[PDB]
Ligand binder design. Structure first.
Ligand SMILES: [Mg+2]
Ligand SMILES: [Mg+2]
Ligand SMILES: [Mg+2]
Ligand SMILES: [Mg+2]
Ligand SMILES: [Mn+2]
Length: 292
DNA sequence: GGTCTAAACGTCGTAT
DNA sequence: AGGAGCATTTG
DNA sequence: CAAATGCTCCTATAC
DNA sequence: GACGTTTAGACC
């Protein structure tokens, strides 16, 4: 069963990397090797997420050693990647990374990089890309101005599957058991839904809430969590949403278990000892407690 | 004051 | 998630 | 040859 | 990402 282009970019907003590697190479005429890359790497457990992305695009090399990756490094394969994101844009601050990457891509594809002028222009871009220029690259190209980075603002969720894609990456479905004397069982049971993202996209988080019509912002010193704790919102909004917009990967099974636990809470089995014991068993085979 | 939900407040460690 | 470079193939 | 791409190993904090 | 405890205060 094929994936949706929107869950792809959603997941890519969450997990993907756009990269430029600039390495010394005296064999080249500038003395420097310049290449672009696009990659997603994750736990071996989710090889099959990459496989469904590879089936979709018909491009990309998949590896599996200590982790599992899908990479696009040739021009032929990057054309496919750029055809994708021009048609289905990113909406996090990764958009800015992408626009820099795309800039550098054209330079390279057009061979404009085999040139002092090009090489320099490509560094301005690298300087503003993800982690910027390293201490040694800063030395090799002294006082090179970082290219202007688009501050990505006022973004509207383009498709509901974008959310399913993004929460497949940054989302979490867990059950919170709290030691509390004032409950007959001695514990509080709660269903929590969560999305996490660096504070630079707090704007985006704030209207995911508007999009879903539920949840609270939580700033932890920074990061931002979108947290839904309200049981009714989980019952009427979150579950039916993800029932329509499918999570991909192993998280699907955590979602199912979680969803099963919501029913139990809904039927109030969490207020009886047998209920609590049952939930604890499901919960312990869930997220961090699942296996091979 | 008993029982409970919501959510504020808190932290660990590795998948990404 | 993000990084860098040696190894090998290409034209 | 020199340029492109393959392959594989290093780093570390946003989730 | 996912696990844990404390606090505000609703409802009976
Ligand atoms: Mg991320
Ligand atoms: Mg994950
Ligand atoms: Mg990082
Ligand atoms: Mg993460
Ligand atoms: Mn992530």
């Amino acid at each position: 069963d094929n994936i949706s282009p929107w869950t792809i970019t959603g997941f890519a907003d969450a997990e993907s990397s756009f990269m430029l590697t600039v390495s010394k190479d005296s064999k080249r005429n500038t003395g420097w090797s310049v290449r672009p890359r696009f990659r997603i790497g994750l736990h071996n457990k989710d090889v099959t997420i990459l496989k469904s992305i590879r089936e979709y695009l018909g491009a990309g090399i998949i590896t599996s050693d200590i982790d599992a990756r899908i990479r696009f490094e040739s021009l032929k394969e990057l054309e496919v990647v750029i055809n994708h994101f021009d048609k289905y844009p990113l909406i996090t601050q990764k958009r800015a990374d992408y626009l820099l990457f795309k800039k550098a891509f054209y330079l390279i594809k057009n061979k404009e990089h085999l040139t002092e002028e090009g090489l320099n222009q490509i560094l301005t871009l690298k300087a503003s890309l993800n982690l910027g220029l390293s201490e040694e690259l800063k030395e090799a190209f002294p006082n090179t101005i970082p290219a202007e980075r688009l501050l990505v603002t006022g973004q509207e969720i383009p498709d509901s599957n974008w959310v399913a894609g993004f929460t497949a990456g940054e989302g979490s479905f867990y059950i919170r058991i709290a030691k509390n004397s004032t409950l007959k069982t001695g514990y509080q049971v709660q269903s929590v839904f969560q999305i996490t993202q660096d504070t630079r996209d707090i704007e985006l988080m704030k209207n995911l809430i508007s999009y879903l019509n539920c949840g609270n912002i939580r700033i932890r010193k920074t990061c931002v969590d979108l947290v839904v704790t309200n049981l009714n919102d989980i019952k009427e909004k979150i579950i039916p949403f993800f029932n329509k917009n499918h999570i991909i990967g192993v998280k699907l099974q955590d979602y199912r278990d979680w969803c099963k636990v919501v029913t139990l809470i809904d039927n109030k089995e969490h207020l009886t000892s047998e209920g609590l014991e049952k939930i604890q068993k499901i919960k312990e085979g869930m997220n961090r407690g699942r296996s091979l």
